Amino acid sequence: CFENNYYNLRHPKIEDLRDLIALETLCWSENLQVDNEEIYRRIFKIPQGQFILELEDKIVGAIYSQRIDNPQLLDNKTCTQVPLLHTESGVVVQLLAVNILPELQNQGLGDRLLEFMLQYCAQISGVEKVVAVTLCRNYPDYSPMPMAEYIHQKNESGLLVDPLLRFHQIHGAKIEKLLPGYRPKDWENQTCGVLVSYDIQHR
C-alpha cells in the first residue's frame, strides 16, 4: 500500500543532537559511525547544509553535507580529516552521509531525500559541483576481484551490481575513482572509499 505517513523535512537544531547520534548508531556499524563531535560540528557550524527527516515526533532520517574548494583535496585523506576541508565559500558541495532508519529502508526514503538535497544544492549560489565519497556493501562477495574493476561491474540492465553504488548511479552519479585509505577501519572495503560526482548544470 501507499504509506500515507506524515513526513517533515527541516534543518537540524541543537536539540536534535541526541537523536542524530542515536540514528548514527542504528544505521552504521561501529567502524563506520562518525563520532559525536562531528555530528555536533555539522549541526552547529553549518545547519544550512543538513536535513533531518521526521516521522511524527521521531527523527528517522538525515542527510549531511559541507562545502570544499575542489574534489582533488580528497586525495590521500582519511575521513577523520575531511571536516578540516570545509570552507564557507567552497564551490563544491560534499555530501558526507545519508542515514535512513533500517526498519524504514527500501520504501523510497533514501531516494526522495537525495533528490531533494541535489535540487537544494543546485539553488545554492556559488555552487558548481556536488561530490560524495561512498563505499561498497557487497565487495567481500567479489573478492579478490580488484575493486577498480568491481566499481564498474554492471548487471543486465546496465546498472551497477553494488547496491550502494547503484543508489548513486540511478540519481545521475558518475563513479569517478577509488579513494584508498579514506576509511582506515573499513576492512571489508580494504579501507577504500569511492568518489562519485553529480552534474548539476541542468537542475
Ligand X SMILES: CC(=O)SCCNC(=O)CCNC(=O)[C@H](O)C(C)(C)COP(=O)(O)OP(=O)(O)OC[C@H]1O[C@@H](n2cnc3c(N)ncnc32)[C@H](O)[C@@H]1OP(=O)(O)O
Q: Contact region for ligand X (CB under 6 A) — 34-42, 44-52, 95-103, 181-189?
A: 95-103
What does the alpha-carbon distance between residue 69 and residue 76 come to, in Å, rounded to a whole number?
16
Check residue 114 and give left, alpha or beta (phi > 0: left; psi -120 to 50: alpha): alpha
Q: Contact region for ligand X (CB under 6 A) — 66-74, 127-135, 139-147, 179-187?
A: 127-135
Q: Judge whether 137 is annotated as a binding position.
A: no
Instruction: For the CB of residue 17, give the shortest distance to ligand X in the complex, in Å.
Output: 20
Cβ 61 vs Cβ 103: under 8 Å: no
Q: Judge whether 110 is annotated as a binding position.
A: yes
Residue 60 is inside which H or E element, if any? strand 58-68
Which of residues 23, 74, 97, 195 is near ligand X by CB under 6 A?
A: 97
What does the alpha-carbon distance between residue 40 and residue 56 come to, in Å, rounded to a whole number?
23
What does the alpha-carbon distance between residue 176 and residue 195 come to, in Å, rounded to a whole number?
5
Residues 100-119 that bind ligand X (CB under 6 A): 100, 105-111
Q: Judge whether 134 is annotated as a binding position.
A: yes
Does 146 sit near ligand X (CB under 6 A)? no
